[PDB]
Design an enzyme around this catalytic site. Structure first.
Site, mmCIF file in Angstrom:
data_model
loop_
_atom_site.group_PDB
_atom_site.id
_atom_site.type_symbol
_atom_site.label_atom_id
_atom_site.label_comp_id
_atom_site.label_asym_id
_atom_site.label_seq_id
_atom_site.Cartn_x
_atom_site.Cartn_y
_atom_site.Cartn_z
ATOM 1 N N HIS A 216 -135.764 -44.499 57.843
ATOM 2 C CA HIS A 216 -136.672 -44.070 56.783
ATOM 3 C C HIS A 216 -136.031 -43.111 55.790
ATOM 4 C CE1 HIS A 216 -140.460 -45.657 58.627
ATOM 5 N NE2 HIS A 216 -139.717 -45.581 59.716
ATOM 6 N N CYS A 249 -135.840 -46.442 52.063
ATOM 7 C CA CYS A 249 -136.612 -46.275 50.837
ATOM 8 C C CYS A 249 -136.098 -45.196 49.896
ATOM 9 C CB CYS A 249 -138.055 -45.918 51.172
ATOM 10 S SG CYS A 249 -138.907 -47.212 52.079
HETATM 11 C C1 LIG Z 1 -139.851 -46.310 53.212
HETATM 12 C C2 LIG Z 1 -138.644 -46.481 54.147
HETATM 13 O O1 LIG Z 1 -137.696 -45.735 54.076
HETATM 14 C C3 LIG Z 1 -138.648 -47.650 55.094
HETATM 15 C C4 LIG Z 1 -137.231 -48.280 55.167
HETATM 16 C C5 LIG Z 1 -137.152 -49.374 56.210
HETATM 17 C C6 LIG Z 1 -135.788 -50.156 56.160
HETATM 18 C C7 LIG Z 1 -134.661 -49.435 56.852
HETATM 19 N N1 LIG Z 1 -133.442 -50.193 56.701
HETATM 20 N N2 LIG Z 1 -139.611 -48.638 54.589
HETATM 21 S S1 LIG Z 1 -140.901 -49.178 55.473
HETATM 22 O O2 LIG Z 1 -140.658 -50.545 55.845
HETATM 23 O O3 LIG Z 1 -141.062 -48.413 56.705
HETATM 24 C C8 LIG Z 1 -142.382 -49.038 54.480
HETATM 25 C C9 LIG Z 1 -143.436 -48.282 54.977
HETATM 26 C C10 LIG Z 1 -144.610 -48.159 54.213
HETATM 27 C C11 LIG Z 1 -144.698 -48.789 52.989
HETATM 28 C C12 LIG Z 1 -145.961 -48.654 52.187
HETATM 29 C C13 LIG Z 1 -143.618 -49.556 52.491
HETATM 30 C C14 LIG Z 1 -142.459 -49.683 53.242
HETATM 31 K K LIG Z 2 -142.396 -47.716 60.984
#
Ligand SMILES: *CC(=O)[C@H](CCCCN)NS(=O)(=O)c1ccc(C)cc1
Ligand SMILES: [K+]
Ligand code: NA
Ligand code: NA
Ligand SMILES: [Pb+2]
Length: 452
Positions: A216, A249
Site C-alpha cells: 500500500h 497507489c
Molecule cells: C492504494 C494502494 O496502494 C493499493 C496498491 C495495491 C497494489 C500493490 N502492488 N491499492 S488497493 O488495491 O488496495 C485499493 C484499495 C482501495 C481502493 C478504493 C482502490 C485501490
Molecule cells: K487490502
C-alpha cells in the site's frame, strides 16, 4: 504481438527533446552538457519561449510538432525530458485515471502508446534540480567512491493481511529466483517477505542500487513498512544513489498539494534516488503483479519464467534491450497490457496503466546490474581534421561519442567486430582537446580526450 509491435523505444543516434521551466536554465546546464558528451543530440527549449508557452495545450502542441517533424526527417526524438513541477508543465487529467499524467505529451496526436520515453525532473527550485542532477552525474559517470553498493538491493513485499501472501511475496520471490541473486552478482539481496520488517529501510542508508516496494501507498509514503517523505529527508546514503520503484497507489501523484513521495525521493540532496517509478492514481494487485512478473501469473501460485510473459524484472535483465529506467516502466506496462489482451484476469483497461505510471528523475539513465564491467577500446592518438567519419575500436554494442564544450560532433555504435563508425554530423575544423565518451549497458563509462 504487442511485444513485437510496441517494444523498446531506444534507438541511436540518441535524440532527446527537453522542455524546461525558464527558471532552470543555469541549473540544467551540467546535465545537458553530460548528455551531449555521452552522445545525445539535444533539442532544448524553455517555457518562456513564445512557441512553447507555460500552458498544457501549447506545450503539448509544441512537443507533438517536434516529434512529427523529427520522424518525417528520420530523426525522431527518443526521449522527452520535462523539467519542472506542475506549476510550469502541468500535465493533464488521465481520461481513465482521472489523475495527473504526462502521457499525452508523448502520445502523439491519436496514438495509444507513447511515441517517446518521457520522464519528469520535477523540482520546485534550481537547487532541487541540481540535487537530482548531481546524483545522476555521480551514477552515470560512476564516480562514486565505493562501488560495492551496486551489488546490493532491497526488495519488500509490504503488509497486507490477505494480499501479501497471494501476490506480494510471489512477485518478490520471482525477482529473486531469476535475477536478484548471487549468480547475477548481487552480494546482498535484502528482502522482506512479511513482518517483522524492522531494519528494512536502514539498508537504504547503508547502500543499495535498487529498492522495490509492493503493497500500500499514499501520496507521501510507502505505507507499511512505513517510509514517509519526512523519513526520506533524513536518509544518509551519501554517494549511494538508487533506482526506486513503488508498485503501489499514488506515490507519483505529482500535482498533490504537498510534494509526492516520488518527487521527494529524487529531490533530496546527496541522499535518496536518482530516479523513481511509481503511479499517479491508484494501482491494483493484479495489474502490478503482471507489471513486475509478466502475464499469466496466478494469485497464490509461485509464477515461473517459462510460464509467464515478459515483465519488468525480465526486461531489466535482458542484456540487449530494455536498458533504461524508462524501458523498465514500459515493460511493466506492456505486460499489464498483454495480460489484458490474452484474457488474464484484469479489472481495468490497459489504457489506465499507460496513464498511471511515471518516471520522476532521469529516465534516460541506464542502470547497472550488480557490478558493471570494464569496457575495452583503443583511443587514437589524434583525429585528422575534416573527416566525415572515424573508425574507433570499442566492444561490440558500445556507443561512442565525440564532442567539445558540450557540443556533440559525432556518434556511432561498435559493430560485432568491435569497430564503431563515428559519423561526424559536425566535422572537426579547429585544434583543441576533444572529448571521447564510450558507454554500454552495464559497463563503466569511458571518458577520455583526444588532442587535435
Ligand atoms: C492504494 C494502494 O496502494 C493499493 C496498491 C495495491 C497494489 C500493490 N502492488 N491499492 S488497493 O488495491 O488496495 C485499493 C484499495 C482501495 C481502493 C478504493 C482502490 C485501490
Ligand atoms: K487490502
Ligand atoms: Na515473466
Ligand atoms: Na535490459
Ligand atoms: Pb509536485
Amino acid at each position: 504481438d504487442v511485444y513485437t509491435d510496441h517494444g523498446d523505444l531506444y534507438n541511436t543516434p540518441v535524440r532527446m527533446l527537453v522542455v524546461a521551466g525558464a527558471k532552470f536554465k543555469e541549473a540544467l546546464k551540467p546535465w545537458l552538457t553530460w548528455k551531449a558528451q555521452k552522445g545525445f543530440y539535444l533539442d532544448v527549449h524553455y517555457t518562456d519561449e513564445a512557441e512553447v508557452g507555460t500552458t498544457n495545450a501549447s506545450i503539448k502542441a509544441f512537443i507533438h510538432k517536434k516529434y512529427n517533424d523529427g520522424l518525417a526527417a528520420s530523426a525522431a526524438p527518443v526521449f522527452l525530458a520535462l523539467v519542472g513541477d506542475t506549476d510550469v508543465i502541468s500535465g493533464e487529467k488521465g481520461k481513465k485515471t482521472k489523475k495527473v499524467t504526462d502521457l499525452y505529451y508523448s502520445a502523439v496526436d491519436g496514438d495509444y502508446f507513447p511515441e517517446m520515453y518521457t520522464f519528469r525532473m520535477s523540482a520546485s527550485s534550481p537547487e532541487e534540480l541540481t540535487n537530482i542532477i548531481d546524483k545522476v552525474l555521480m551514477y552515470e559517470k560512476a564516480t562514486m567512491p565505493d562501488k560495492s553498493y551496486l551489488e546490493k538491493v532491497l526488495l519488500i513485499a509490504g503488509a497486507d493481511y490477505s494480499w501479501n501472501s497471494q501476490v506480494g511475496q510471489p512477485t518478490i520471490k520471482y525477482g529473486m529466483q531469476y535475477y536478484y541473486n548471487q549468480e547475477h552478482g548481487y552480494t546482498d539481496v535484502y528482502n522482506y517477505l512479511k513482518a517483522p520488517y524492522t531494519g528494512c529501510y536502514s539498508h537504504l542508508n547503508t547502500g543499495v542500487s535498487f529498492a522495490n516496494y509492493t503493497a500500500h501507498g499514499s501520496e507521501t509514503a510507502w505505507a507499511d513498512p512505513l517510509l514517509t517523505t519526512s523519513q526520506l529527508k533524513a536518509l544518509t546514503n551519501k554517494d549511494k544513489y538508487f533506482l526506486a520503484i513503488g508498485n503501489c497507489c499514488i506515490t507519483a501523484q505529482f500535482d498533490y498539494v504537498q510534494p509526492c513521495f516520488g518527487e521527494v525521493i529524487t529531490r533530496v540532496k546527496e541522499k535518496g534516488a536518482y530516479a523513481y517509478i511509481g503511479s499517479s492514481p491508484n494501482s491494483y494487485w493484479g495489474e502490478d503483479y503482471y507489471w513486475s512478473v509478466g502475464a499469466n501469473a496466478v494469485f497464490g501460485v509461485q509464477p515461473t519464467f517459462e510460464g509467464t510473459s515478459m515483465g519488468s524484472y525480465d526486461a531489466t535483465f535482458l542484456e540487449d534491450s530494455y536498458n533504461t529506467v524508462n524501458s523498465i516502466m514500459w515493460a511493466g506496462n506492456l505486460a499489464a497490457t498483454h495480460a489484458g489482451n490474452i484474457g488474464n484476469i484484469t479489472h481495468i483497461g490497459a489504457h489506465y496503466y499507460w496513464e498511471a505510471y511515471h518516471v520522476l528523475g532521469d529516465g534516460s539513465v541506464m542502470p547497472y546490474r550488480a557490478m558493471p564491467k570494464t569496457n575495452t577500446y583503443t583511443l587514437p592518438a589524434s583525429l585528422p581534421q575534416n573527416q566525415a567519419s572515424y573508425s574507433i575500436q570499442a566492444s561490440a554494442g558500445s556507443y561512442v561519442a565525440i564532442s567539445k564544450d558540450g557540443v556533440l560532433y559525432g556518434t556511432g555504435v561498435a559493430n560485432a567486430s568491435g569497430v564503431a563508425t563515428v559519423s561526424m554530423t559536425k566535422q572537426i575544423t579547429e585544434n583543441g582537446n576533444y572529448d571521447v565518451v564510450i558507454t554500454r549497458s552495464n559497463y563503466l563509462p569511458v571518458i577520455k580526450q583526444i588532442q587535435v
